[PDB]
Amino acid sequence: DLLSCLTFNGVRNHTVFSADSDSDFNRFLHLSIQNPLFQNSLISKPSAIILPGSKEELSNTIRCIRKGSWTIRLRSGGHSYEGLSYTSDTPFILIDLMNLNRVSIDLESETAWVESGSTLGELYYAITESSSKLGFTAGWCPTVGTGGHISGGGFGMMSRKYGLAADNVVDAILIDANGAILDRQAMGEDVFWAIRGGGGGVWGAIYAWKIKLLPVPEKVTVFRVTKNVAIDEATSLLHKWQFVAEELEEDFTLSVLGGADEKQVWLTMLGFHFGLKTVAKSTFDLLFPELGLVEEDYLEMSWGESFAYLAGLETVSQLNNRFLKFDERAFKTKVDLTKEPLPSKAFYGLLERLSKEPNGFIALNGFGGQMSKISSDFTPFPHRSGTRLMVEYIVAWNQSEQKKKTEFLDWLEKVYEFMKPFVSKNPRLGYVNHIDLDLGGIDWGNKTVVNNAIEISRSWGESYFLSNYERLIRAKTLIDPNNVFNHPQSIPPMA
Ligand SMILES: *Cc1cc2c(nc3c(=O)[nH]c(=O)nc-3n2C[C@H](O)[C@H](O)[C@H](O)COP(=O)(O)OP(=O)(O)OC[C@H]2O[C@@H](n3cnc4c(N)ncnc43)[C@H](O)[C@@H]2O)c(*)c1C
Ligand SMILES: *[C@@H]1O[C@H](CO)[C@@H](O[C@@H]2O[C@H](CO)[C@@H](O[C@@H]3O[C@H](CO)[C@@H](O)[C@H](O)[C@@H]3O)[C@H](O)[C@H]2NC(C)=O)[C@H](O)[C@H]1NC(C)=O
Ligand SMILES: COc1cc2c(cc1O)-c1cc3ccc(OC)c(O)c3c[n+]1CC2
Ligand SMILES: *[C@@H]1O[C@H](CO)[C@@H](O)[C@H](O)[C@H]1NC(C)=O
Ligand SMILES: [Mg+2]
């Protein structure tokens, strides 16, 4: 019946569930699973997979699915930390957007239309190919899809200069629950606001984003330097880093990846300057001489090269490979946002815990700069002025380490508990692109829960969106009153 509808409407690229271990269905299913944690045979599988090739096919796909009794799941890059683009407790249809990966750059207006199956790397590659003086602000991981990423905000190495990816979206095409094809004018300002950070899988299916391309110099300066130190020095480095990072002028970003193993601590310093190396080094010589950076650490390169380099890719060309395996490990991650400086003992304790679990690592970013100049309600991401750091805790493992899964998860849980007193409180803040089901979830098939959905959902909702939660609920009711687009943490419509 679903197939007959799709055929009648000219949607041809689909595959039904097959039990065949290496069926084509299984190949398409796994192609974009980016967290192996959700790859095993015990996980829910789609009844069919549809690959629309145009906005019309996407529209008609949704229209057909509604005639039936299916849960819709949209997948762009498949990076959901909780696998929410390709799992469901109820029978579901997976709409995989990988064929919608066209990027159209308009050099006369310095904007681009980006189909939502496009990855960040594909976007960055397209931009660098078109111009040596344009770039875009989005995340660090190249295989992340624009569909989920921009829908949730999108923070990266240029966010201190230009804000989130979603802060630079000027139009969009949203396909709603009825298959309507809506641009910014059609969807209205509340819905256009909601889609720019309100979370993927909630408002409808984004077909394409229209973004403003942003100036970059023909040469930027970057460094990627790993310090191998002991805990005393690592603690003093991280404690000073937090001040340097938040306080740097907007033309600079200094971020950290860190981990340890008994007495050996490693800190990878990621630096970016919107300009030349003499200025870059003068700045860090003054503000952070403790890093011990030397001239040879500073590299001048194009913006495109810088984004490939900072992510550890071999070449700019690799940005354009959506199936390049960036990190093939099962993982779980949590995040904190901070409002007060972290005391030295917080870093010391975090490092002690990392030293006991070599499979764990942290990623540290400063806010400030343009992130403090954008109002908390400009887009749904509310963590602007007053927010000092974003701190990510990750534990990751390969298949040969699977028996330690429980131990790994316990470690992460204990790290998050340790950090509680030092980070944001009342509520403990989060980021919707860093979706965390530990906060809870709605079973939309449960009547008593659904009756109280707004209050229940406030637990994660206010963590992700603070005071923007209310407007999100109103936008949800306007664009998806029947809740066609739902998941355990989707914004509830009013009854
Ligand atoms: C795996 C991974 C994730 C990263 C990485 N680095 C990040 C960074 O530097 N900055 C960030 O801000 N975020 C980083 N993240 C997290 C990602 O930002 C999030 O995981 C994104 O949400 C992922 O988006 P995508 O890859 O498209 O993942 P999906 O699982 O397909 O979708 C997520 C979510 O959104 C819905 N959705 C997808 N596509 C659409 C469209 N077109 N319209 C509406 N909704 C859509 C899905 O159904 C799901 O709910 C680094 C790494 C390695
Ligand atoms: C539905 O969509 C999928 C995914 O795009 C289509 O599969 C893709 O088909 C193209 C050909 O049109 C493949 O391109 C070629 O692959 C071969 C190697 O296998 C190579 O010789 C060519 O140079 C080119 O790379 C592509 O590999 C393939 N992608 C995947 C993930 O399978 C499929 O054709 C569509 N199905 C229908 C019925 O339209
Ligand atoms: C499971 O695999 C991975 C998972 C993640 C990351 C890296 C991985 O390898 C990661 C690394 C980051 C490094 C730097 C950075 O800003 C400078 C980030 O925002 C990062 C975000 N993330 C998101 C989670
Ligand atoms: C609905 O949810 C409540 C609270 O989570 C749970 O206790 C109850 O068992 C559920 N009811 C049904 C009918 O599943
Ligand atoms: Mg077989």
- The full set of domain ranges for the chain reads 1-100, 101-218+302-325+427-495, 219-301+326-426
Ligand 3: residues whose CB is within 6 Å? 140, 157, 255, 257, 270, 327, 329, 331, 333, 363, 365, 392, 394, 396
Common-topology check for domains 1-100 and 101-218+302-325+427-495: no
Q: Which fold has domain 1-100?
A: 3.30.43
Within a 10 A sphere around the Cβ of 392, how many other Cβ atoms?
16
For 112, phi then psi, to 5°, come to -145, 145
CA 279 to chain centre: 31
107-142 per-residue burial string, b: 16 or more CB within 10 A, e: under 16: eeebbbbbbbbbbbbbbbbbbbeebeebbbbbbbbb
CA 387 to chain centre: 18
CA 41 to chain centre: 26
- 449 Cβ inside 6 Å of ligand 4: yes
d(CA 213, CA 215): 7
- Ligand 4 centroid to Cα of residue 479, in Å, is 28
Q: Give me the residue label for tokens 């889609």.
A: 195
Per-residue tokens: 375: 């109002």
Q: What is the CATH number of domain 101-218+302-325+427-495?
A: 3.30.465.10
**Hey, whose CA ends up nearest to atom 8 of ligand 4?**
446
- Ligand 3 centroid to Cα of residue 257, in Å, is 8
Q: Which fold has domain 219-301+326-426?
A: Vanillyl-alcohol Oxidase; Chain A, domain 3 (3.40.462)
Q: Determined by which method?
A: X-ray
d(CA 6, CA 214): 40
d(CA 233, CA 302): 33
d(CA 272, CA 25): 42
Pairing of strands 92-96, 48-50: parallel
Pairing of strands 299-301, 330-337: unpaired
Resolution value, angstrom units: 1.6
Ligand nearest to the CA of 155: 1
For 115, phi then psi, to 5°, come to -60, 145
